[PDB]
Every structure is written in C-alpha cells, then in structure tokens.
Amino acid sequence: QTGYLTIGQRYQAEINDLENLGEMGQVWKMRFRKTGHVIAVKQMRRSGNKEENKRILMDLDVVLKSHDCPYIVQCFGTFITNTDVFIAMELMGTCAEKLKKRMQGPIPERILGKMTVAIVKALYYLKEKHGVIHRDVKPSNILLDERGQIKLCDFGISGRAAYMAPERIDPIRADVWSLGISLVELATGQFPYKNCKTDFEVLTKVLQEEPPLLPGHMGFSGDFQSFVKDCLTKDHRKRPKYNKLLEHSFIKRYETLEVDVASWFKDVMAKT
Ligand SMILES: *CCC(=O)N1CCC[C@@H](n2nc(-c3ccc(O)cc3)c3c(N)ncnc32)C1
Numbered sequence: 001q002t003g004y005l006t007i008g009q010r011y012q013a014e015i016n017d018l019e020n021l022g023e024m025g026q027v028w029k030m031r032f033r034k035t036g037h038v039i040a041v042k043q044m045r046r047s048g049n050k051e052e053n054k055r056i057l058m059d060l061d062v063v064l065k066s067h068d069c070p071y072i073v074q075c076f077g078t079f080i081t082n083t084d085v086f087i088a089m090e091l092m093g094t095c096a097e098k099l100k101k102r103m104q105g106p107i108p109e110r111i112l113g114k115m116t117v118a119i120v121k122a123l124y125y126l127k128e129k130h131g132v133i134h135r136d137v138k139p140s141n142i143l144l145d146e147r148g149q150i151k152l153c154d155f156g157i158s159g160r161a162a163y164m165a166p167e168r169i170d171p172i173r174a175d176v177w178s179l180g181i182s183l184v185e186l187a188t189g190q191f192p193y194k195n196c197k198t199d200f201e202v203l204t205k206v207l208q209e210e211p212p213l214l215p216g217h218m219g220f221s222g223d224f225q226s227f228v229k230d231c232l233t234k235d236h237r238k239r240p241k242y243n244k245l246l247e248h249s250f251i252k253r254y255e256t257l258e259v260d261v262a263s264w265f266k267d268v269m270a271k272t
Pocket of ligand 1: 091140141
C-alpha cells in the first residue's frame with residue numbers, strides 16, 4: 001500500500017513523480033507530473049517531534065479506515081522513504097475559519113445547513129463504524145472546496161480547545177457541543193467567548209453562563225435555532241444522541257434541499 005497513488009485510476013508512482021507547488025498555510029500542494037492532477041501532501045519527517053508524529057499517524061489511521069465516508073478527507077496514497085513519510089490526500093479549498101475571515105461577516109444559514117448535515121454524519125460514522133470520537137470539532141477542522149464538498153479533516157487526538165462540552169470539563173456526545181459553538185461562531189461572525197483572556201476563563205463561562213444561543217433578529221429559521229439549542233444542552237444526558245440528531249427537522253431540510261455551495265465558495269474565494 002506504499003508507492004501507489006489512486007486519484008479509479010491507480011498509478012505506481014514515487015515521491016519525485018510530484019511537483020512541489022508550495023506550502024499551504026507541513027502540508028504541500030503538489031502536482032502529479034504524469035497526468036497533471038493537483039493533490040495535497042503532508043510530510044512527516046522521521047526526526048520530527050515524537051508527539052506530533054504520533055498524532056499524524058493516528059489521523060492517517062482513521063482516514064484510511066474511512067475510505068467509504070463521503071464527509072471525510074480521502075487519502076490517495078502513501079510514500080515511505082528512509083527519512084520521511086508522505087501522505088497524499090484530496091486537495092480541498094480552505095477551512096471554515098478562513099472562510100469566515102474572508103467573508104468579514106456572518107456565513108449564510110443555507111451554507112451552514114449543508115455544513116451541519118455533513119459534520120453530524122461524519123461524527124456519526126466515526127462512532128458507529130469505528131467507535132471513534134473526534135474531540136476537537138471547530139471551524140478550522142471543516143474543509144470546503146470548489147466543488148461544494150464539506151468534510152471533516154483532523155483526527156489527530158481522536159479517541160476510541162475552547163469548544164469543550166460541559167461534561168468534558170466536569171465529568172459520548174461531547175462533539176455535539178463543539179459543533180454548536182462552531183455554528184454560533186460561523187452564523188454570527190463572532191466567537192461567543194472572545195472577551196476571555198485565558199483558557200480557564202473560557203471553561204468557567206461554559207459552566208457558569210447560559211448556553212450561547214443564536215440571536216433572534218438575524219432571520220434565522222426556527223429549525224436552525226432549535227438545532228443549536230439542542231447541541232448546546234449543558235447536561236450531556238439530555239443532549240440527544242446522533243440517532244436523534246439525524247432526525248432533527250434542520251437536518252432533514254438540508255438533506256433534500258439543493259444549495260449551491262460551490263458557487264458561494266467561489267464567490268467568497270474571489271473576494272479579498
Ligand atoms: C483551516 C485550514 C488551514 O489553515 N489549514 C492549515 C494548513 C493546511 C490546511 N489543509 N490541511 C489539510 C489536511 C491535512 C491532513 C489531513 O488528514 C486532512 C486534511 C488539507 C487538505 N487535504 N487540502 C487542502 N488544505 C489542507 C488546513
């Protein structure tokens with residue numbers, strides 16, 4: 001499973017069959033010299049940090065297991081040298097965190113609806129088919145592309161950080177609270193805990209204050225405010241499992257609705 005790159009068509013290639021087009025944001029944007037396809041390649045050096053390499057290997061482990069989930073970044077191949085490990089992956093556009101900064105404002109609900117559906121099914125696929133919890137859902141971990149695809153990416157600390165659930169600071173569905181905070185941030189353009197100066201102060205506001213719900217004067221649908229209210233339940237026992245979440249009216253609306261995510265993505269990317 002090393003030395004092959006499958007971008008249907010499988011190619012027996014190596015590392016220098018790729019052209020380095022620069023670093024993204026270590027993830028390289030590389031071009032396959034044989035055909036011309038552009039892919040994303042992460043480089044893990046053997047002399048790198050021991051903790052970082054362990055987190056990279058755990059992320060690739062989950063990615064290789066989830067080759068059938070359409071809401072997870074697919075890996076095309078792997079190259080192992082005497083000094084490095086190159087992980088070829090699907091080239092996405094950018095993360096929702098960078099989409100918010102370029103929008104310089106709120107992200108429309110119809111875009112977040114398709115985003116919500118993709119993230120819950122990815123988190124539900126991880127707990128069902130692999131017993132995986134993500135434990136780090138945030139806008140920087142939500143990748144978009146030019147074709148309108150929405151996928152979850154980082155599984156470096158997945159199990160078998162200001163988005164922490166109340167049950168995770170004072171002890172399942174902890175990833176649901178992180179999704180709710182991410183939705184409020186992307187829907188309002190403001191992080192609900194931006195005034196905090198330390199990590200601990202964020203944790204005290206989570207347990208002492210009411211859940212940061214969506215405003216009511218921005219035209220948000222009733223189903224959108226209901227879904228965020230359910231995700232931001234402070235007691236994890238009343239927070240619904242993924243089985244009940246996938247039956248929410250906000251989920252069912254955007255499972256069927258056709259939303260032009262691709263053109264909205266290209267329109268935002270064109271702006272400066
Ligand atoms: C929020 C986006 C961002 O700034 N970054 C950091 C720089 C790399 C960006 N990026 N990461 C991945 C990636 C890496 C590893 C796995 O397992 C999945 C995804 C990207 C991919 N695949 N394509 C484009 N950009 C990526 C994220």
